[PDB]
Design a protein around this ligand. Structure first.
Ligand code: 8Z7
Length: 364
C-alpha cells in the first residue's frame, strides 16, 4: 500500500530523491533546530522530549521495532506521506492550485520543493513567477525566480529548483550527482567501488592540502557522519558532500573553517568529541588510539592534556570505554586550574579519580 513497488511505474528520479539532495536525508532519529526528534527528510516524530516516545511514534509509522533507525526506503515512505499532505495543501491553496495543476510532474516536484522549503505562504508570494509558470513561460519564470531572496538564501538549491522549472528535467540533479560521482571516482577503492579506502583517504587529504592526521580531517569525517576511521563509504561521501552543499574539493576546502566555527558551540563540540570515540575504535577504544585522538580534540580545551598524556603512558595499558571517553570532556570543562573543585564523589571513572591524584604533584 505504502509499498514503494506501487511507485515503480514512475521515474526513478522523484521528489523524494530531489529533497534528499536539497534538504538531506537522515536515517536515524536526530533533533532538529528546534530540538524535536526528527527523521528521514525533515519528518517530525514528536515534540516530546523523550527519545523513547520518538521511537514509539517511529515504530507506529514504520510498522516495526526501529530502534530509531530506518532504511532509505522507509524514509521515502514517511516522506511520501508528507508529500501527499503538502500536495493536498497546495490543492487547497487558491493561489497555488492553478499553477500546480498546470504543471507537468517534474515541475510539480519543483513547486513541491519550494513549498517544503518556504511553505505555501512563502511560495504564493512569487505571484509573477507563478503566473509565468502557469503560462509555460519557463525562461521568464526562471529569470524572475532568480531575482529573489530565496535565491540569495539558498542559491545552490534554488538554482537546481529553478533549472527544474526552466527545463522540466532533472538535469540539475543528474548533473550534481554526476559531478559528485566523478569526484568520488577519484578516491574510491579500486577493489571496492563503494568505499574509499586508505589510499583514497590520503588522496582526498592531499587534495584538501591536509595532514591526514590533523583535526580538520576528523572534523570533516564528523560532518560526513563517517562510521569508522579505516574507510570512507560512497554513501558517506555522497551524503556528506550533498549535505555540506559541495560538489568540489574547492568547495569542501572552503567549508572547513565553517565546520571549525561550528565546534565553538559547546554542544556541537560535545557531539564532535563523542563522535570521535565511535569513529576511532574498531567495530572500547585502544589506549594508544585514544591518546592520539585526545591529543587532537582536547588540545586547547583540556588544561591538563600534557599531564593526562604522561599519566596514561605510565599507567598500565587498558582499553578506554565510551563513558570514560565521554566524561573526560565533562571533567575537562568542569575542572579548576588546580583541580581544587574536584568532587571525588562525583562518580567520575576510576581512571579520572586516579588522574586527579597523579596530577597533585604538578598542581602544587
Ligand atoms: O580520517 C580517517 N578516515 C576517514 C574516514 C571517513 C571519512 C574521512 C574524511 F574526513 F576524509 F571525510 C576520513 N583515518 C585516520 C587518519 C589519521 N590517522 C592517524 C591519526 C591521526 C590523529 C589521531 C589518531 C590517528 C588514523 C587514520
Amino acid at each position: 500500500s505504502q509499498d514503494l513497488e506501487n511507485l515503480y511505474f514512475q521515474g526513478s528520479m522523484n521528489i523524494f530523491e530531489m529533497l534528499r539532495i536539497d534538504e538531506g536525508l537522515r536515517l536515524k532519529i536526530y533533533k532538529d533546530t528546534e530540538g524535536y526528534y526528527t527523521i528521514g527528510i525533515g519528518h517530525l516524530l514528536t515534540k516530546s522530549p523523550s527519545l523513547n516516545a520518538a521511537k514509539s511514534e517511529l515504530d507506529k509509522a514504520i510498522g516495526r521495532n526501529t530502534n530509531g533507525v530506518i532504511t532509505k526506503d522507509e524514509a521515502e515512505k514517511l516522506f511520501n506521506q508528507d508529500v501527499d499532505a503538502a500536495v493536498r495543501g497546495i490543492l487547497r491553496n487558491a493561489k497555488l492550485k492553478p499553477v500546480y495543476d498546470s504543471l507537468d510532474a517534474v515541475r510539480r516536484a519543483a513547486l513541491i520543493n519550494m513549498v517544503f522549503q518556504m511553505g505555501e505562504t512563502g511560495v504564493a508570494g512569487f505571484t509573477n513567477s507563478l503566473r509565468m509558470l502557469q503560462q509555460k513561460r519557463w525562461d521568464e519564470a526562471a529569470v524572475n525566480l532568480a531575482k529573489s531572496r530565496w535565491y540569495n538564501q539558498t542559491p545552490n538549491r534554488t538554482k537546481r529548483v529553478i533549472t527544474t522549472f526552466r527545463t522540466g528535467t532533472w538535469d540539475a540533479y543528474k548533473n550534481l550527482r554526476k559531478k559528485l560521482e566523478q569526484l568520488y571516482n577519484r578516491y574510491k577503492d579500486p577493489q571496492d567501488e563503494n568505499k574509499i579506502g586508505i589510499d583514497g583517504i590520503q588522496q582526498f587529504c592531499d587534495d584538501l592540502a591536509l595532514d591526514p592526521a590533523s583535526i580538520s580531517v576528523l572534523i570533516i569525517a564528523w560532518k560526513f557522519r563517517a562510521a569508522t576511521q579505516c574507510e570512507f563509504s560512497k554513501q558517506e561521501f555522497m551524503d556528506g558532500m550533498t549535505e555540506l552543499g559541495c560538489d568540489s574539493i574547492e568547495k569542501l576546502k572552503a567549508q572547513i573553517p565553517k565546520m571549525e566555527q561550528e565546534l565553538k558551540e559547546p554542544g556541537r563540540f560535545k557531539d564532535f568529541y563523542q563522535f570521535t570515540f565511535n569513529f576511532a575504535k574498531n567495530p572500547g577504544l585502544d589506549l594508544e588510539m585514544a591518546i592520539a585522538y585526545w591529543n587532537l580534540v582536547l588540545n586547547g580545551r583540556f588544561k591538563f592534556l600534557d599531564l593526562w598524556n604522561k599519566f596514561l603512558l605510565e599507567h598500565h595499558k587498558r582499553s578506554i570505554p565510551k563513558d570514560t571517553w565521554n566524561l573526560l570532556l565533562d571533567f575537562s570543562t568542569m575542572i579548576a586550574d588546580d583541580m581544587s573543585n574536584y568532587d571525588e564523589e562525583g562518580a567520575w571513572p576510576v581512571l579520572i579519580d586516579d588522574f586527579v591524584e597523579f596530577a597533585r604533584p604538578q598542581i602544587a
